[model samples]
Target chain A: ASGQPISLMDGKLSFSLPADMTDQSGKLGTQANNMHVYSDPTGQKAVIVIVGDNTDEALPVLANRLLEQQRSRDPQLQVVTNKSIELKGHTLQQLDSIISAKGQTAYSSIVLGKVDNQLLTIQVTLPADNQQKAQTTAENIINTLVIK
Target chain B: ASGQPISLMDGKLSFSLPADMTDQSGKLGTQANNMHVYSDPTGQKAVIVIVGDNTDEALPVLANRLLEQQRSRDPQLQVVTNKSIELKGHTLQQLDSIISAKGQTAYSSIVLGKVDNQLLTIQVTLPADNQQKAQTTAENIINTLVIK
Candidate 1:
């Protein structure tokens, strides 16, 4: 899919994702909490990105807290892949998993990292049938992740 | 002092602060998580801003969580003044306090509110002796806080 680069936090962070991604964060009723959330027209597929301070905790500790929160939200979520990647000299922890709810399955990935004293999280999820599409978008987004 | 308007989170949020407020966020070392941190030349006075999502909570609940975190950081912190205010038709929870550590006193204010599912926080701190200066700067910043 043709994509466009999105500069966030005043160019401090950015990435290029599918141009079709429309910001539907407000529809989630979390306008106060989400920095930005892009989704497909159906609203079932989305990428949410937020940034905050972690001045008091180590990256690993903060990452664990975030992962725990994710698990709390989806107790049946199954972790399929867990690892680290270095992008732009920053080490980010990424989690790939499957979440099942009401007999429906979805593919998901949560990327967490520290930039200076801030913590950044990019989470993407889509229907299980769209795993390939999800992975492709996630990879493209991560590959273009820029932190300054 | 002159001031500049800084746009954050891709213009999702922004405010105007003293032009002399150096960008010390990178120096604190977590550039990814922090939207921006501006401080005076000496770094003793600063404003730290962060943006994030509250996927499963209400605005009041999130605001309470922030207040708790603040208390955890300073046992003796005294809430000198606090009141609710509305800006641009959005209700905002504001807290102003005085904190002393290492024999140094500082005036601080924390503003909490929601903008389109995003939780926005603006924390400003300066020497207690600079209360007038701090209040003026903080007021200007808050008054100009534009969330789109």
Candidate 2:
């Protein structure tokens, strides 16, 4: 079943968040420049979307670029899964990784896809040892994402 | 100790392989395109250099690109170490990893650096268990590398 549909970045994207997740834009307040944060009540997991447009290199290259940037903060970060996934009729590059940061380790999924004329990147992260709910939530977003 | 000085790519690069290592340009013969291979007699270790002029993106991006490429062949491949290394007045990016391929696992070092107007990538690899020589041989080549 579809959760509430969301239109973001001035209608550049439309997607649904998991039923239990809600917008946390005010959680980041002024610091939330060019970012939209959504999380479930526990706040232990989040789906983060950046506000921007990129017609740069291919998704593979851009995915690696994002992976590289993460390594700076998580020296032990490792990509455990990388593959192309079909979602809502669009192909998305998905990198599932185990990330270490701020003295804790977590599991995260980063997705990139070309929809319409723009590229959108979405990342969902939760503590590494956490249960499967976050992983399910993460994939659910991809299942419902619609870029315009 | 310095090994024999070798020049290649129409003199675009010059570096000495390890003392026990010798040129293997003929090893690949016509199959080798724009590449130089130098290895020790045992063939257990070698330093490989690709010949090209790259005024492209930063080494970190390119290094990650290479890492991503390797993941295609070795899905289980993981980057054990990634750091900036100081060499002959130039800073280089080094990625150390264990790779799985062709029914075997090996250790490899991929390096990228800027010298003059071009970027050079050098790699040294051996069976994962590694001989002490892996470090010596790889570092020796970098210690003496000259790019012009």
Candidate 3:
């Protein structure tokens, strides 16, 4: 499990990265607005944040569109659950999915929501064997996301 | 300066980019949600869209925060105007500013607003020498933004 919560963005946002995880925000280049990336030292697991313009699309529509994109990438992608998650008194649509490839399974949890006029997607991915650990990490990170 | 407006996100969001501007969305990596980027072939002139989670900060507060960031980068930056811009029946706060460096000038216009629960910012930057061309282009793009 990750240790020690570190404040990010001048205390406007905070989240914990695995003790062995390295901040990869610099390597992300210009796509780095309101974005952060963390990965295991070996680079096997990754956490990424994507926030960008919203043309006022409904939550369910955006959720389905994103799910379709993921399904296309992995034909066998399975949606374990699609439900509402509340964070800081705000409701967000969340998708829990799994994809199997070459005898290995990858687990992903995609959280989608709109804050102000921006659309946000917080995604976490890890090996299936580490799903429980990764899921907990993801939840902890999402819970601590405070927008100032 | 640009061609016909093409439907993006199935018309959920649409804007026209100059015919000479190339789409750089693909180069933005996995952190790109509804983000888009357009740039001239020379890459000297560029436009980018960054959308993501925003706290429910008031327009004035958000506007001042952005201006502060700009002022920090260019101590001599001057604000040309800070006014309300109406688009598609919604009112947005618009900020226009200019920064000079090495006998040249850079122009920037940043618009901020909220759509539903999401916070949005549309920003454009170009050289002062090309202000007329870039300003018109930026205005047209901003005016045509349709957020459902």
Candidate 4:
């Protein structure tokens, strides 16, 4: 809306997630369970997360489409502070050790989902200088989440 | 010049001044003495002080004019930030305190002086939210100093 997608990975916002993963059989704290999925016009798979009292299913599709359109038009641009990494198979016990040595709560962004009764999560870290980018990505992601 | 004054003061900028009863002199330091005076066309007087250099002289007129202008433009506003305070009276001792507290260097500002001594001095002391206001005021003061 501001002629450019708002950057995530900006440290403007300090947010918190569940202290530890809970509910293995069901997705409780995962954003993926709370969000909606939509197919683009070209039939490509895209994801959206909507957040509100009355979750709008189509909102996720709209958000994903808009974001994709903007990014496609403007190449070499990104929303997150840095490139996204996949942390699917990483165990919580191992993560706890890594997080203890290097603070994870201070991290800027994280993506959570559930697969086969196991929780799959990805954590994205951002530097202080990239705080603005982190925040932009966080806001966009939060805006797209849909629970319905 | 973005046709605007640029100031960047975010976190702690602390300093300490000597409370010397042994020094009978009215001024604290040397010719590069620290002094800050804020005035308005309506005769409102405010004083600012910080330890540093003071090159320009007689800044009261500019400060006063700025007070009047800013007050008129943003009547409901309070607090100021982002404006550098002239470092005339600031000594190395005092500067150490500031840098130690904030872990950064600091500067000074003045108004109403060009060919003569100054009337007011100001240290960059403004709140984050009030930065915009302080910026405008600082620019006007600098412009006035440059001319008169």
Candidate 5:
């Protein structure tokens, strides 16, 4: 789960899961096992993986980190996320501003990821640069991860 | 609904209805006409009025404003909103945070003022010192008017 963020050669994984405080069916470890992290096997390389739980608390952190990475990787790509993943969900944003700072319609592709309980679990966007490269990178990132 | 923040006085008429853009049955107007406004019977008191087509967009703005008022007005109250409201339906904590901003708990009443579509509707909430006052303020505000 640690080191290099994620590298195909490492075969390591990182994800978000219930904190074991939830009283549910299988152990949270089962859910973690269900999350498989991989890079695009199609060799096209087009995505990165991000995740959160039923309450979806981690999504904002994921989005924020992604936003930082998006800028660090590519700035003009216009990374926008659904309201549930970044704005109000990010306590800092809620405490400071009212809207999610608009300016999101410019994004190319947006994902709802999945819902746990009722919260959004994941979201990702392309970064500026060789957009083709970024898409391929993103795809490759998602390829490494499998839900089953 | 734009730059100006909405508040309990805006929905003082329908304290029970969830807040501007939430009323689906048109009960708020009926309730408003039955009561009198504290400012004036025919004129207008700071009544909680429901007007908007996008509760999804509106709630966040409203919640932030509500939190501001609750925190500034009481100073002892704590506010917490359901981060999920940024997604779809509203939650209790979301409502609470909109009404209270400190560490203390205060209930914000809900009124489904109007519903034209899934994401479009007007909902309103009222702020009272306590849950009961919030309810009464809602009734009084709603009891005084006719919906257009």
Candidate 6:
């Protein structure tokens, strides 16, 4: 499916999303504040975006804390990739993992970026069966992200 | 000795300096450009201030490279303190060390800071015979340093 440019959080964030995906932000429970969600028709695969205050800590430190919270819920969580990209005094941390919870396995990608005094978190998740698709989608979204 | 507030680099840098110190910017041979120097009449103790472009690297990385250059010139260089202090959106790296060069021993304090995409390095040094006095002076200078 083709992708279309979209802006969320009152235009504070801009990115590309599959044309077939639909807004599912209200479909999920209140897991966090300033959180937005989107997914394909099946609704099993989704992209979650959260705009939050900045943490003065380095990327690696913040990543570890994020992982800790996830690992607590999914004992079978396994990280496949973790890397950082820096430019112009800004850093983005990308984390790819496989998480098993409630007997269901999911492929997940979590991206964190900081600009000024703000933090942006973008997460992509899909059933393990779509592992490759999940990764590809996550990369595309993160690589094209623009924060204001 | 008590310190009186002074500004250098056209008001870009402000700090407290010993009332007895004299401006020595023109004393030494040209070692670097955009550098400002001040010291006691003894000429064995001094403060060297240099303003240059930022390296866009972590403080520790920058500190290591600085140490490498010094170590090459002074085989007897020994680090006494290395620490980073952060506040608001800025970080300052303070390095204290013992150095031997040209058959002379010196106590040194090297402090690095960043602002306006520029790097500001301040060094307080005194002959080793006055190590304790040097330490006290270095502490006073660094703790009161103000950079633009």
Candidate 2 residue pairs in backbone clash: none
Total backbone collisions for each predicted model: 26, 0, 13, 55, 75, 0
Top lDDT prediction, candidate number: 6
Q: lDDT tens string, model 3, A6-67? A: 44233432333223223322221223345533332112244455556654667777678767
Error of 3 at B91 (Å): 2.5
DockQ of each: 0.01, 0.01, 0.01, 0.01, 0.01, 0.01
| Candidate 1 per-residue lDDT over residues A1-148, each given as its tens digit | 4235444455533333223223322222222233544432122344556665545555566556655644764687677767787766778788777765433456766776766555666666655656676566556545545555
The interface RMSD value for candidate 5 stands at: 27.5
Residue by residue across A1-148, what tens digits does model 5's lDDT show? 1112211112221111112111111211123211111111110111111232443435355445435533543344343332442322332110001111112111222233342332222122222224464444333322332221
- Give the lDDT of residue B34 in candidate 4: 33
> What's the true lDDT of residue A68 in model 3?
82
> Ten consecutive residues with minimal summed lDDT in candidate 5 chain B?
B36-45
Candidate 6 on B21-58: residue-level lDDT in tens? Answer: 23322222222234433432122345555555656677
Candidates' interface RMSDs, in order? 21.0, 25.8, 21.2, 28.2, 27.5, 29.3
Q: Residues A1-148, candidate 4, lDDT per residue (tens digit)?
A: 0111111123211111112211111122223332221211111111222221322223233334333533443343244332222334521111100011111111223343333343333222222234454355344433332221
lDDT of 4 by residue, B1-56 (tens): 01121111111111111111011112223233332222111001111332234444
Per-residue alpha-carbon lDDT of candidate 2 for residues A56-131, written as tens digits (9 for 90 to 100): 5787876777677557556777776678887556777897777764334556788766654445556666545453
What TM-score does prediction 1 earn? 0.38
Q: Give the Cα lDDT of each candidate.
A: 0.53, 0.52, 0.53, 0.25, 0.27, 0.55
All candidates' TM-scores?
0.38, 0.36, 0.38, 0.18, 0.20, 0.38
lDDT of 3 by residue, B1-148 (tens): 4435433232332333223223322221222344433322112233444454546567777778767866764678788868887766767788777755434355677776665544555555555666676566556545545554
Error of 6 at B41 (Å): 1.7
Clash pairs of candidate 6? none
DockQ of 2: 0.01
